């Protein structure tokens, strides 16, 4: 069902968003407590970027497959869902960038 595809996509994006939120919450504790050496700051920036790339890839995959799934179903409201999924992914990508911007500030 197109409505089920939409709901499941929104649920998956909420799950990824909560993963990014818990990641940032734990990162606030990790950066503030660590010995911020030149090697640590270089390594932690890479680790954060690697983690946020995985989250961004996961959200991109959800939006891409939902858009494809809906395009096939219309060959059997829909565009409203397409817009909300695109909107959620866009908002999630802005959130991911903002976590990376703040992490770079706590490390320096």
């Amino acid at each position: 069902s197109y409505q089920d595809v939409c709901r499941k996509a929104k649920e998956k994006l909420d799950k990824i968003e909560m993963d990014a939120k818990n990641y940032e919450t734990n990162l606030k504790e990790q950066a503030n407590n660590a010995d911020k050496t030149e090697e640590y700051r270089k390594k932690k920036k890479i680790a954060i970027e690697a983690f946020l790339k995985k989250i961004e890839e996961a959200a991109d995959k959800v939006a891409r497959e939902a858009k494809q799934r809906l395009d096939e179903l219309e060959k059997k409201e829909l565009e409203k869902c397409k817009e909300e999924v695109e909107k959620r992914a866009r908002e999630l990508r802005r959130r991911i960038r903002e976590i990376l911007e703040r992490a770079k500030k706590w490390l320096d």
Epitope: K15, I16, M18, K21, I55, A58
Partner: single-chain antibody, 228 residues
Amino acid sequence: EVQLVESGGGLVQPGGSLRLSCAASGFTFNTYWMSWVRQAPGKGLEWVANIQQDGSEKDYLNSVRGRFTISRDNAKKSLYLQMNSLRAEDTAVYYCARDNPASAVAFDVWGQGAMVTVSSALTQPPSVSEAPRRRVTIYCSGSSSNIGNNAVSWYQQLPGKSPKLLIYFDDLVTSGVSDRFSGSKSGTSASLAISGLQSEDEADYYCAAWDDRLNGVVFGGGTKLTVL
């Protein structure tokens, strides 16, 4: 301190019921997915269930559907597993686990396990070996519905200990885990490479991934690593 403590284990008759509980502390329990994973005596890991932050979604191992119920009470920071219609196949140590990142289906915190007595999709090599300071690789062969489309996790289990997450999202290393453990995924197979082998690396290693067809987490059969 991030901790998960299970209780409620015991001996039950076949057809009976038992309720396990898990007390969580050291983290915001209400913001995480939580899970149960079991291990029959002398056997490999087998995932049982997941539950979303507020109970909006539940995932189950097919063989426990209609018998088990996962639930949580965020005020009491507790995860539960109500087990009904018990069978001999359900005898196992049941581990309470945190599922984080939930989008990677990775069990990043494990409890010590509660023992319960009622009285294949992923292929791994049964054994791998090498001398200290050398390297080994452990394959994990799957299909398009699991490894092909979903993030792979790797776990290390030392004798008499709970499993520990090493790798998640196919190749991200858990914070605190040595960078000599590395993961990779190509097509429908995954690999864990361990270089700089130490005597403490002697353990069973398990891969896992979500499977779209089985609608659940699948684990490999495990690999016993021996250090010469």
